[PDB]
Amino acid sequence: APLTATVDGIIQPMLKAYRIPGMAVAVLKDGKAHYFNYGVANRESGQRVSEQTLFEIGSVSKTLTATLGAYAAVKGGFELDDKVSQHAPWLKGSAFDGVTMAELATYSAGGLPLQFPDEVDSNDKMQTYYRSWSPVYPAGTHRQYSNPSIGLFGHLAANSLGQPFEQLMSQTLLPKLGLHHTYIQVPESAMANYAYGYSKEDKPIRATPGVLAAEAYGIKTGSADLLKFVEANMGYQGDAALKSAIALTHTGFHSVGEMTQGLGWESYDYPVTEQVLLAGNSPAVSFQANPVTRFAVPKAMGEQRLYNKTGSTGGFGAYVAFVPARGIAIVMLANRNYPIEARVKAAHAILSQLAE
Ligand SMILES: *[B]([O])([O])[C]([N]C(=O)[C]C1=[C][C]=[C]S1)C1=[C]C(C([O])=O)=[C][C]=[C]1
Ligand SMILES: [Zn+2]
Ligand SMILES: [Zn+2]
Ligand SMILES: [Zn+2]
Ligand SMILES: [Zn+2]
Ligand SMILES: [Zn+2]
């Protein structure tokens, strides 16, 4: 069917059902970007959503952090199989003597939690927290989705090149990817484009600052820049190091059921059913530890995959999925944190129609 009717017919009922004030949708098909914009960025002002509206993308940020980490590895800052304490002198002698950088990146260090404990909320206390942490599971055996885990990976990866994370992201990675309207901290000059998010009580909210927030869930961007990053994941040509870095993000390290964990990106064998894609993105996988299917060696996952990432903040809900072999992708950025199941069902419906 026609593209506008396909997208509208799936997105509009969902926006009504979940009272989502605004959504920017971007689709890749036939080598071209297409933008579908709904509703408002700011309920009070009535500013309309466009592909230039800045949304909080939450944990979709982890795909950019993972790309930065891979870039630092390609540039020689570390090897993925290095022990974490080789790259954090303050962790020498801790449990991180027995955890690799790859395990940190892929949530398999041994039971680091979803969030930092409440008062682990300064750099000093963060260091003490990791230095004193007692593993729950042997390294590499269990996947427990974790902000502290990938957060530390990003932080250490940037330090391995001698820079803070925010500097390496903003001055090197984003410009090299051609993302010039993507930010960790939205500058005053771009504030007019920044949406508000909406809480369950319909109050306007924005992201909460926090330890390793930048690395784990801190990016603000619009659908056009985010789709440009997806395009770089479909086939990128340019900086050899950045090309290699993106390839590393498509390497699989272990699996949990039908989901294979990469750096940032999670993927599925394609074609993939709605049921499987939902399950891989459900709480049984995202909010509890699971034993992994170990890989003999990390594997390039290739083009016949659906790669995806969910992300949220208090006021925002994002999802991205792409299928390189079919030249199709979707970005959906909303200013309500609405259920992941709805995001996945809508994206799967649209992608299925894009592949006919
Ligand atoms: B990520 O998976 O979206 C990540 N995001 C955050 O920690 C930022 C949020 C602040 C309030 C709601 S999300 C994350 C999200 C969740 C979650 O949705 O319960 C859990 C762990 C990490
Ligand atoms: Zn178009
Ligand atoms: Zn405190
Ligand atoms: Zn940091
Ligand atoms: Zn540090
Ligand atoms: Zn720039």
Residue numbers in the entry: 6 to 361
The authors write:
Plasmid-based extended-spectrum AmpC enzymes, such as the FOX β-lactamases, are increasingly found in clinical isolates from antibiotic-resistant infections. FOX-4 is of interest because it rapidly hydrolyzes cephamycins. The first generation of BATSIs inactivated serine β-lactamases (Ambler classes A, C, and D) through a dative and reversible covalent bond to the active site serine nucleophile. In this analysis, the structure of FOX-4 in complex with SM23 and LP06, a ceftazidime mimic, is described.
SM23, a chiral cephalothin (CEF)-based BATSI, bears an R1 side chain with a thiophene ring and an R2 side chain with a m-carboxyphenyl functionality. While apo enzyme crystals contain one FOX-4 chain per asymmetric unit, SM23 (CEF analog) complex crystals contain two chains per asymmetric unit with an RMSD of 0.27 (0.52) Å between Cα (all) atoms. The boron covalently binds to S64. The two boronate oxygens adopt positions consistent with all prior BATSI structures in class C enzymes; one oxygen points into the oxyanion hole and the other takes the presumed position of the deacylating water. The carboxyphenyl ring of SM23 (CEF analog) binds in the canonical binding site of cephalosporins, via hydrogen bonds between the carboxylate, S318, and N343 that are mediated by water molecules. The BATSI carboxyphenyl ring appears to form parallel-displaced π-stacking interactions with the side chain of F293, a residue that is unique to the FOX family. Additionally, the thiophene ring extends out of the active site and does not make significant contacts; instead, it veers away from the Y221 side chain. Overall, the SM23 (CEF analog) adopts a similar shape in both FOX-4 and the E. coli AmpC, with the positioning differences apparently linked to the side chain conformation of L119 and the steric bulk of F293 versus L293. Notably, the amide carbonyls in both structures point toward N152 in spite of these side chain differences, suggesting a common requirement for binding. Since the carboxylate of the carboxyphenyl ring of SM23 (CEF analog) binds in the canonical region consisting of S318, N343, and R349 in FOX-4, this interaction may be the most significant one for increasing binding affinity.
